[PDB]
C-alpha cells in the first residue's frame, strides 16, 4: 500500500509499505529517500508518536494515510 509523509518544511514524501511493517521499517524507507537515520525520526499520526517495535496495523494505519516527520537528536 501507499502512505505519505509530510516534513516540517512542507515536503511530501511517498512510501510503498505493508501493514505488517514495523515502524522501524517505515523509517528505514524514509532513510533511503531523505537520508535521515531512523533514530533521528519521529513519525506522528492521528496525534500520537509511533513506537518502534510496533507495526502499521497496531496503529490501524490504513492506505493513503498521511504521517508527519519530525526530526529528533536520538
Amino acid at each position: 500500500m501507499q502512505i505519505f509523509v509530510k516534513t516540517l518544511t512542507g515536503k511530501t514524501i511517498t512510501l510503498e509499505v505493508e501493514p505488517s511493517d514495523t515502524i522501524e521499517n517505515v523509517k528505514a524507507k524514509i532513510q533511503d529517500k531523505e537520508g535521515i537515520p531512523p533514530d533521528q525520526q519521529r513519525l506522528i499520526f492521528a496525534g500520537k508518536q509511533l513506537e518502534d517495535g510496533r507495526t502499521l496495523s497496531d496503529y490501524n494505519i490504513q492506505k493513503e494515510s498521511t504521517l508527519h516527520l519530525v526530526l529528533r537528536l536520538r
Binding site: 516540517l8 519521529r42 506522528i44 492521528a46 496525534g47 500520537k48 508518536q49 508527519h68 519530525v70 529528533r72
Partner: protein, 219 residues
C-alpha cells in the same frame, strides 16, 4: 415544521448564537446513506447517534469559509441543537476527537515533550504543563465554539473552514446550502431539496457567504 418555520428558525439562530453548515460531495450519498437511515430510526424505535458528520460553524458577522475545494458542493444548514462531538479551528466515534493540534502546537512552542502524550487522551492539566496554546486546543461544547470564534467575528477577519463533529437528526435540518457562483452546486441542491421535501422536510435554499445568509427562491 414547514419551510417558513425552518427558515425563521435558521435566521434566528444565525443572527444570534450561530449554527452549522455541512457541505457534501455527494448529495445522493448523504440523502440515501445518512439522512434516510437517521429518519428510519426516528420513525421506528427512535433516533440514535450512529452517524456522525463534519460541518463548519457559521454565524452572522463571522466571515468564515466552508469546506468546498472545487466550489461545487451543495449541503445542509443544520440546527445548533445538533449533538456536538468536538470542534476545532484547524483541519468517527465520540472520543476520537483530538484535544489539541499536535503538529500545530509543536510548530508554535517547539516543545518536544508534546510528542510524549496522546492528543486524543490527554488531561487539561497535562496540556497546561505542556504549554499548549489555546488556539491549538479543541473545544467540546457550543458555548466554547462561540467564544473561540468571537475574536475573528468581531474583528471582521476572514477565517478558514472550521470543523465540528456533529450528529444531526432530521428535525435539525433547516436549509439547503447553495453556492451562488456554481452551476453544479445549484443543480445538486435542486435535486436534494426535492428529495427531502418528498419525505416531509420542505427546506429553503440558503446562500451562505462571508458571515451573511440569504434565502433563495429556486436554484
Amino acid at each position: 415544521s414547514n419551510r417558513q418555520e425552518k427558515l425563521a428558525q435558521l435566521m434566528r439562530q444565525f443572527e444570534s448564537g450561530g449554527l452549522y453548515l455541512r457541505t457534501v460531495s455527494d448529495h445522493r450519498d448523504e440523502f440515501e446513506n445518512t439522512f434516510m437511515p437517521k429518519l428510519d430510526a426516528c420513525l421506528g424505535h427512535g433516533c440514535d447517534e450512529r452517524y456522525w458528520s463534519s460541518a463548519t460553524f457559521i454565524q452572522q458577522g463571522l466571515n468564515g469559509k466552508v469546506h468546498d475545494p472545487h466550489a461545487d458542493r451543495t449541503g445542509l444548514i443544520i440546527s445548533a441543537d445538533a449533538r456536538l462531538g468536538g470542534f476545532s479551528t484547524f483541519d468517527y466515534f465520540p472520543g476520537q476527537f483530538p484535544k489539541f493540534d499536535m503538529m500545530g502546537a509543536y510548530q508554535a512552542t517547539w516543545n518536544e515533550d508534546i510528542f510524549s502524550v496522546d492528543a486524543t487522551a490527554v488531561s487539561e492539566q497535562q496540556m497546561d504543563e505542556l504549554g499548549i496554546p489555546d488556539e491549538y486546543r479543541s473545544v467540546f461544547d457550543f458555548d466554547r465554539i462561540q467564544e473561540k470564534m468571537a475574536q475573528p467575528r468581531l474583528a471582521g477577519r476572514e477565517v478558514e473552514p472550521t470543523e465540528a463533529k456533529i450528529c444531526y437528526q432530521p428535525k435539525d435540518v433547516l436549509g439547503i446550502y447553495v453556492d451562488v457562483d456554481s452551476p453544479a452546486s445549484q443543480s445538486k441542491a435542486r435535486e436534494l431539496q426535492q428529495a427531502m421535501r418528498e419525505q416531509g422536510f420542505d427546506l429553503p435554499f440558503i446562500a451562505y457567504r462571508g458571515g451573511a445568509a440569504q434565502e433563495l427562491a429556486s436554484v
